[PDB]
Design a protein around this ligand. Structure first.
Ligand SMILES: Nc1nc2c(ncn2[C@@H]2O[C@H](COP(=O)(O)OP(=O)(O)O)[C@@H](O)[C@H]2O)c(=O)[nH]1
Ligand SMILES: [Mg+2]
Lengths: 164, 89
């Protein structure tokens, strides 16, 4: 059987929910305490638009190490938390860094606003949607807690990698 | 590998003596569990060691957590070990 493998990297400031999103996707439950400095990679077999895909997903915590992660990565999930302004401010830095390392103006990415289950919100949909627009990438809101948008964020990133 | 584990337990006691101002004397490993992590270009392991050491002459039980990171930089393996925690049972 034909399969296509994709190399995906999850990046964002500490505490935005990188570990939680990945483990939701992989394990179908919310991990509210996962070591904040541990990195791991995961493999999930999934059908996206009829293609049998192997997603090799790296959960970063963040170096030469980090540079390697970015050369190897094909698509990047840029995560902030909707109740943290500075996590949203940091996004430029991550995107700039990836563009620096890979040395390309077009790098598959998706902007993710996580924790959208929460009644507090510091960042507006429109602010995020404007940023995504300026970079020409898609924006999904998600909750690692309730699984809202989780599948969609990863699938959307795969679609982005295909586009290139 | 019982050697490897024993060497890491000795390392844990040593690092506890140096960084937590103690003078425990390693006796033996009582049990070990091992958790593995493979971020890209790494083979990392957290060890959970239960060990026996003498505190002012008296045998007591301790739980040590030791982190071993092994990373391929260029085409060369770089190895790193670090005591994470050490506490009495
Ligand atoms: N309510 C809610 N909490 C979340 C969500 N994602 C992560 N968290 C919590 O926020 C903290 C950070 O999660 P973690 O995945 O460790 O963040 P990381 O540092 O980016 O890997 C943890 O206590 C999580 O339980 C979410 O979507 N909703
Ligand atoms: Mg994490």
């Amino acid at each position: 059987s034909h399969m296509t493998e994709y190399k995906l990297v999850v990046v964002g400031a500490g505490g935005v929910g990188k570990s939680a999103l990945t483990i939701q996707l992989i394990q179908n439950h919310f991990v509210d305490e996962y070591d904040p400095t541990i990195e791991d990679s995961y493999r999930k077999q999934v059908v996206i638009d009829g293609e049998t895909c192997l997603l090799d997903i790296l959960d970063t915590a963040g170096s030469a190490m980090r540079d390697q992660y970015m050369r190897t990565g094909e698509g990047f999930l840029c995560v902030f938390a909707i109740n943290n302004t500075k996590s949203f401010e940091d996004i430029h830095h991550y995107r700039e860094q990836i563009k620096r390392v890979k040395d390309s103006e077009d790098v598959p990415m998706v902007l993710v606003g996580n924790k959208c289950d929460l009644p507090s919100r510091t960042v507006d949909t429109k602010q995020a949607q404007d940023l995504a627009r300026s970079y020409g990438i898609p924006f999904i809101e998600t909750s690692a807690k309730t699984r809202q948008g989780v599948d969609d964020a990863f699938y959307t990133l795969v679609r982005e990698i295909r586009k290139h | 590998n019982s050697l490897e584990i024993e060497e890491l337990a000795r390392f844990a006691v040593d690092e506890h003596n140096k960084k937590e101002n103690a003078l425990l004397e390693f006796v033996r490993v009582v049990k070990a569990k091992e958790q593995h992590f493979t971020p890209w270009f790494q083979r990392n392991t957290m060890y959970y060691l239960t060990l026996e050491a003498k505190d002012g002459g008296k045998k007591k039980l301790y739980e040590a957590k030791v982190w071993v990171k092994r990373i391929m930089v260029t085409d060369k393996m770089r190895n790193f070990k670090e005591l994470q925690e050490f506490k009495p049972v």
